[PDB]
Every structure is written in C-alpha cells, then in structure tokens.
Amino acid sequence: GETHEFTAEISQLMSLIINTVYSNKEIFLRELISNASDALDKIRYQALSDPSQLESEPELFIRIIPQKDQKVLEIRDSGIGMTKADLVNNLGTIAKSGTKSFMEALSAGADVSMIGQFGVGFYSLFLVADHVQVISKHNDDEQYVWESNAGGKFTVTLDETNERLGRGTMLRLFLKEDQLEYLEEKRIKEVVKKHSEFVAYPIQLVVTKEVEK
Numbered sequence: 601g602e603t604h605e606f607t608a609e610i611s612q613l614m615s616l617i618i619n620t621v622y623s624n625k626e627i628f629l630r631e632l633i634s635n636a637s638d639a640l641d642k643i644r645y646q647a648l649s650d651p652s653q654l655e656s657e658p659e660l661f662i663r664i665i666p667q668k669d670q671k672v673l674e675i676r677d678s679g680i681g682m683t684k685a686d687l688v689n690n691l692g693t694i695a696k697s698g699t700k701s702f703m704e705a706l707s708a709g710a711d712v713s714m715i716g717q718f719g720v721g722f723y724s725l726f727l728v729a730d731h732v733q734v735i736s737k738h739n740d741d742e743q744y745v746w747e748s749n750a751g752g753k754f755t756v757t758l759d760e761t762n763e764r765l766g767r768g769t770m771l772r773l774f775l776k777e778d779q780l781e782y783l784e785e786k787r788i789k790e791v792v793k794k795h796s797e798f799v800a801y802p803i804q805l806v807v808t809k810e811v812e813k
C-alpha cells in the first residue's frame with residue numbers, strides 16, 4: 601500500500617491542467633484512446649514473436665463504461681498493461697522527458713491539445729476529472745491499482761478489490777461536476793467519431809438502460 605511523490609515537473613503539469621479553463625476538454629478522450637491504442641500496438645507486437653503473450657486475454661479492444669451512479673467514466677483496454685515497476689516509476693524518466701518542453705510550449709501559445717506529442721497525454725484526464733484510479737495487469741506481474749487525487753502524492757496497491765482485467769489497463773475518472781456530459785452515450789459517441797477515425801481497434805461503449813416492462 602505504498603505512497604509515492606510526483607516529480608516537480610509532473611506536479612507542475614497536473615496543476616496546470618486541472619486548473620486550466622481550456623474549453624475543448626473533449627480531447628482528454630482522444631488522448632486516453634491513443635494511450636490505449638499504443639498499449640494494444642505493443643502487445644500485438646510482442647505477441648507476434650511470442651503468441652502465448654495473448655493467452656491472458658485474446659481479445660484486443662478498447663471499451664468505455666460510463667458509471668452514472670458514481671459519476672465515474674471508465675476506459676479499459678486489453679493492451680500490454682503495466683507492471684508494478686511501471687506504475688511506481690510513472691514509466692521512468694524517458695517517458696516523461698517532454699513534460700518541461702510541453703509546459704514551455706504552453707507558455708509560448710500552444711494548444712493544450714498537442715500534449716500527446718510530448719508523450720504525456722495521460723495527464724489530460726485532469727481536464728475533466730479531479731481524481732483517477734489506474735488498474736493494470738501486465739503478463740509479467742500481478743494486478744495493481746495506481747491512484748491520484750491530483751496532489752503531490754499517489755499510491756500503488758496490489759489489486760484485491762477490482763474485476764480481473766486479464767491483461768491491460770482500466771482508467772476510472774472521477775468526473776468534475778461540470779463535466780458530466782461525458783457520461784452520456786450521445787456525447788461519448790460524438791467525441792469518438794470526431795477524434796478516433798484512425799484507431800485500428802474496436803472501440804466499444806457500454807450503456808446501461810432500464811427495461812420498459
């Protein structure tokens with residue numbers, strides 16, 4: 601049940617995004633699907649040389665699950681997944697190398713929407729969410745949960761409370777009260793159709809409806 605501290609660049613970064621009055625917040629969703637697609641690219645690459653890598657979850661998919669009652673939006677994929685080392689280290693130093701670059705770009709006039717070219721698009725989720733849990737399962741490890749309140753610290757804990765993923769990652773975004781449109785099927789459909797034409801993988805949406813009886 602370990603606590604860790606964000607680097608000063610990432611804490612700076614998270615503070616910008618969570619407090620930004622940036623209007624086009626729907627790009628948060630394009631960015632998380634791009635993280636997902638890359639993770640699926642990666643297991644697909646490995647499974648080419650070692651097809652047993654897919655046995656943990658033979659289906660390759662992205663899945664969006666609005667949880668209206670909890671005001672949480674979940675984003676799941678069957679990509680490579682992340683080990684405990686990956687989560688504790690926030691993927692290491694090379695992955696976040698562009699954080700300062702990106703922040704310098706924003707000072708010069710850049711659109712928050714180019715965050716993904718600096719390799720840190722994950723943190724765009726704080727445009728719409730004030731809290732996040734990241735559940736992940738890598739073939740080389742057990743299942744873990746990373747969690748952040750958008751503060752200086754985050755936690756990583758062995759996963760003994762969530763559905764088994766088999767392989768891959770699920771994000772649960774605790775939506776800011778001004779962003780609940782993104783629990784809506786129509787809104788979610790608008791945004792995926794807009795920004796995700798060239799994602800090679802099926803993008804599934806899970807919508808809960810009452811049976812008129």
Ligand SMILES: CC1(C)CC(=O)c2c(C(F)(F)F)nn(-c3ccc(C(N)=O)c(N[C@H]4CC[C@H](O)CC4)c3)c2C1
Nearest residue numbers: 635636638639687690691695696719720722734746769
């Ligand atoms: C570790 C984090 C909790 C905090 C973090 O810092 C971070 C970042 C970073 F900013 F570093 F780029 N990116 N990022 C993230 C978030 C979802 C995923 C996915 N849905 O799989 C992901 N996939 C990578 C995993 C590694 C493989 O090489 C390729 C596929 C990465 C995270 C999640």
